[PDB]
From TrEMBL:
Interacts with RcsD. The chain holds residues 129 to 215 of 215 of the full protein. Component of the Rcs signaling system, which controls transcription of numerous genes. RcsB is the response regulator that binds to regulatory DNA regions. One of its GO terms (biological process) is regulation of DNA-templated transcription. Keywords: DNA-binding, Phosphoprotein, Transcription, Transcription regulation, Two-component regulatory system. This is Transcriptional regulatory protein RcsB. The lineage of its organism: Bacteria, Pseudomonadati, Pseudomonadota, Gammaproteobacteria, Enterobacterales. The keyword Transport does not apply. GO terms for molecular function: DNA binding. Belongs to the RcsB family. Phosphorylated and activated by RcsD. Residues 16-81 form the HTH luxR-type domain. The keyword Transcription regulation applies.
Length: 87
């Protein structure tokens, strides 16, 4: 969720993310729960599905946005500020 030195590093590596102005519906749901706290296991159980279709969906958001870490997606949603939770 929130480390301290990989989080200051990752917000310095990406620093923005203004390409596509909204990310796809299931991309935004899987990222909203990852950004809230829930992990790929609990995000799949909450959305009523397996960890495989969640992992393909989080890897579709990771590869479309251009990141190489799960914490880098959490930085992305805080950097753009899509949700009102500052995190």
């Amino acid at each position: 969720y929130t480390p301290e030195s990989v989080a200051k590093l990752l917000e310095k590596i990406s620093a923005g993310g203004y390409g596509d102005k909204r990310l796809s519906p299931k991309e935004s749901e899987v990222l909203r729960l990852f950004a809230e706290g829930f992990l790929v296991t609990e995000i799949a159980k909450k959305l009523n599905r397996s960890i495989k279709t969640i992992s393909s969906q989080k890897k579709s958001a990771m590869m479309k946005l251009g990141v190489d870490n799960d914490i880098a997606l959490l930085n992305y949603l805080s950097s753009v500020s899509m949700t009102p939770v500052d995190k």
